[PDB]
Design a protein around this ligand. Structure first.
Ligand code: HEM
Length: 145
């Protein structure tokens, strides 16, 4: 049910993954500046110059597309989340807490831009908790606690 609750508000996100993806990453870097170092292509870009940056928005679109694809799966997601854990632990080297941060940002963006109400905000935090716990369990399998 919590996946359905989020998907009933995903339309505005999927409608413009570039704009919303750019909003999410811009906000992440503004509110959690230490995360920007984790993107070597973007690390060091002055904050005022991120909202207008097409490459930032394009990567935000990649992130949100994958998250959509996953949702739409409604928890039967292994062929999906295992590769993502693998690349994020071993290639991008993203500590697991950062996924909690981007999920806090996405809740806010969806509240403001996608009509996500109080119950939907809870549903999204629950679904992101499912995703993050699975990423964490796969990180552990790889040696990353
Ligand atoms: C559930 C949330 C997230 C999803 C769905 C997601 C998804 C993706 C996808 C699909 C890619 C490209 C291909 C692949 O790895 O398989 C990617 C790359 C990347 N992601 Fe994530 N990501 C998330 C969260 C994060 C966070 C929290 C960070 C850091 C704070 C991060 C940093 C990166 C970096 C650095 C790359 C490589 C960019 C490049 O080389 O161009 N991601 N992500």
């Amino acid at each position: 049910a919590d996946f359905d609750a989020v998907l009933k508000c995903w339309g505005p996100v999927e409608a413009d993954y570039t704009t919303i993806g750019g909003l999410v990453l811009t906000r992440l870097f503004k509110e959690h500046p230490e995360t920007q170092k984790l993107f070597p292509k973007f690390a060091g870009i002055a904050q005022a110059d991120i909202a207008g940056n097409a490459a930032v928005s394009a990567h935000g679109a990649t992130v949100l597309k994958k998250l959509g694809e996953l949702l739409k799966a409604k928890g039967s997601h292994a062929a999906i989340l295992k590769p993502l854990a693998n690349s994020h632990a071993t290639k991008h080297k993203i500590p697991i807490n950062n996924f909690k941060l981007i999920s806090e940002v996405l809740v806010k963006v969806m509240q403001e831009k996608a009509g996500l109400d109080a119950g939907g905000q809870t549903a999204l935090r629950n679904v992101m908790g499912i995703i993050i716990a699975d990423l964490e369990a796969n990180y552990k399998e790889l040696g990353f606690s």
